[PDB]
A paper describes a structure:
Two peptides - peptide #1 YLVVVGAVGV and peptide #2 KLVVVAVGV - shared a large portion of the KRAS5−6/8−14 G12V and KRAS5−14 G12V epitope candidate sequences. Peptide #1, which has a K to Y substitution at position 1 as compared to KRAS5−14 G12V peptide, is transported by TAP as efficiently as the non-spliced epitope candidate. Some structural differences in individual peptide binding were observed when comparing the 9 mer peptides (KRAS5−6/8−14 G12V [KL][VVGAVGV] and peptide #2 KLVVVAVGV) with the 10 mer peptides (KRAS5−14 G12V [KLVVVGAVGV] and peptide #1 YLVVVGAVGV). Specifically, while the N-terminal and C-terminal ends of all four peptides match perfectly, structural superposition reveals conformations in the middle portions of peptide KRAS5−6/8−14 G12V and peptide #2 unique from the remaining two peptide ligands (KRAS5−14 G12V and peptide #1). In the latter two cases, the middle portions of the peptides containing P4, P5, and P6 residues bulge out of the binding pockets to accommodate both peptide ends inside the peptide-binding groove of the HLA-I molecule. In the HLA-I-peptide #1 complex, the N-terminal P1 Y residue makes hydrophobic contact with T163, which is missing in all the other three peptide complexes and may explain the significantly higher binding affinity of 10 mer peptide #1 compared to 10 mer KRAS5−14 G12V peptide. The superpositions of either KRAS5−6/8−14 G12V peptide and peptide #2 or KRAS5−14 G12V peptide and peptide #1 do not show any relevant differences.
The conformation of the peptide in the HLA-I groove is paramount not only for HLA-I-peptide affinity and stability, but also for the TCR-HLA-I-peptide interaction. To study this aspect, we individually refolded and crystallized HLA-A*02:01 with spliced epitope candidate KRAS5−6/8−14 G12V, non-spliced epitope candidate KRAS5−14 G12V, as well as two control peptides (peptides #1 and #2), in which either the N-terminal residue or one of the central residues was substituted, as compared to the epitope candidates. The global superposition of all these four peptide-HLA-I complexes in the peptide binding groove reveals a similar binding orientation with a root mean square deviation value (rmsd) of 0.124 Å. Throughout these interfaces, extensive hydrophobic and hydrogen bonding networking is seen with the majority of peptide residues participating in the contact with HLA-I residues Y7, F9, M45, E63, K66, V67, H70, T73, T80, L81, Y84, Y99, Y116, T143, K146, W147, V152, Y159, W167, Y171.
Residue numbers in the entry:
A (entry chain B): 1 to 99
B (entry chain C): 1 to 10
C (entry chain A): 2 to 274
């Protein structure tokens, strides 16, 4: 009855240090729809984060895109933190630069 | 354009 | 082919107040309208430039209809709690999807109207648009009600009429984007994973529509072993992304080809390192 979210963390454009970009957290395949998604900069919640309107797939599982403008640097670490009824603790997925 | 006829309840 | 689809989600709030209701409209893989019960406007809102040209009668009409949809879902959450003998204490979800496809001939191809309760099939209109698939005895009760109320006849009239006519209107008004294919921008990357092995990753970026096939071949035969294929994902600018990777012996990269199939490609692309 409950399906756990799949998580992808990626940039809209090829990541280049000092070039403005968009950080994406795509959460899919989850049920029910209530979900907490935060984008993290060096472990700290980013404020200006927007998300797509709730929609769902043929199997009725939900998907959302969470996103923020960001400028990648050599030092700064980005991640997506997801909480859902199917998770005993919030799941943190690190942004892998070329994934 | 959405369905115009009122939706029938389950 | 082209599609118009509406998606509705209603989630009950047992602690206080009425269900959260979210409606979204799509043409193909492009969102064009939304309603969110939690938003300030309490209106159907545009989400594509080509729907903004619709006049006030359109926005008033779609707002009236989507609010009526929200009240139907609110009532249905109550009815379904009854059918399944569930307490008032739990949150539950109703989902509805309906819409229509036009084919290569720009004529009606197929219609659909599907309902789910708590993420499981409940009742669905069959492809003939004349019969219902009821998953269980709660849905069988609904089927008997909808047969008596001639719901399939009402939906058939919409799906073969209004639905395809307005899909064709939207496709013309939005043709600059809706009838433009964006072929995937493809490249391969190479990363050593050991002294003896390398990962080849085949990228498909900035494509529209979302439907794509990435396949690896070794010496001209399909290979699935030692491969990874990520779910197609939105870029956030209306286009999509996907990649497929294969682990290969270092020095043997030339044996491997990535094959990309997409509506925007006259012939499939072959990439080689
Ligand atoms: Na890469
Ligand atoms: Na690679």
């Amino acid at each position: 009855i409950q399906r756990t979210p799949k998580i992808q963390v990626y940039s809209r454009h090829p990541a280049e240090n000092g070039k403005s970009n968009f950080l994406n957290c795509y959460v899919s395949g989850f049920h029910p729809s209530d979900i907490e998604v935060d984008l993290l900069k060096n472990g700290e919640r980013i404020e200006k984060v927007e998300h797509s309107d709730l929609s769902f797939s043929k199997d009725w599982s939900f998907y959302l895109l969470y996103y923020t403008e960001f400028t990648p640097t050599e030092k700064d670490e980005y991640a997506c933190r997801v909480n859902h009824v199917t998770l005993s603790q919030p799941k943190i997925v690190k942004w892998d630069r070329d994934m | 354009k959405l369905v115009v006829v009122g939706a029938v309840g389950v | 082919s082209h599609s118009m689809r509406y998606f509705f989600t209603s989630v009950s709030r047992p602690g206080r107040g009425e269900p959260r209701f979210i409606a979204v409209g799509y043409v193909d893989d492009t969102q064009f309208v939304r309603f969110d019960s939690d938003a300030a406007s309490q209106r159907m809102e545009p989400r594509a430039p080509w729907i903004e040209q619709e006049g006030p009668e359109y926005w008033d009409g779609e707002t009236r209809k989507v609010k009526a949809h929200s009240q139907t879902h609110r009532v249905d959450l109550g009815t379904l709690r009854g059918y399944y003998n569930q307490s008032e204490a739990g949150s539950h979800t109703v989902q509805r999807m309906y819409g229509c496809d036009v084919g290569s001939d720009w004529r009606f191809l197929r219609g659909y109207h599907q309902y789910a309760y708590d993420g499981k099939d409940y009742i669905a209109l069959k492809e003939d648009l004349r019969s219902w698939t009821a998953a269980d005895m709660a849905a069988q009760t609904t089927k008997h009600k909808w047969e008596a109320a001639h719901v399939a006849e009402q939906l058939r009239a919409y799906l073969e009429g209004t639905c395809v006519e307005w899909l064709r209107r939207y496709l013309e008004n939005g043709k600059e984007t809706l009838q433009r294919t964006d072929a995937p921008k493809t490249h391969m990357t190479h990363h050593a994973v050991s002294d003896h092995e390398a990962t080849l990753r085949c990228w498909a970026l900035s494509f529209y529509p979302a439907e794509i096939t990435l396949t690896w071949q070794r010496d001209g035969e399909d290979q699935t072993q030692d491969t990874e294929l990520v779910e197609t994902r939105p870029a956030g600018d209306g286009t999509f992304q996907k990649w497929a990777a294969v682990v290969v012996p270092s020095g043997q990269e030339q044996r491997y080809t990535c094959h990309v199939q997409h509506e925007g490609l006259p012939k499939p692309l072959t990439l080689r390192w």
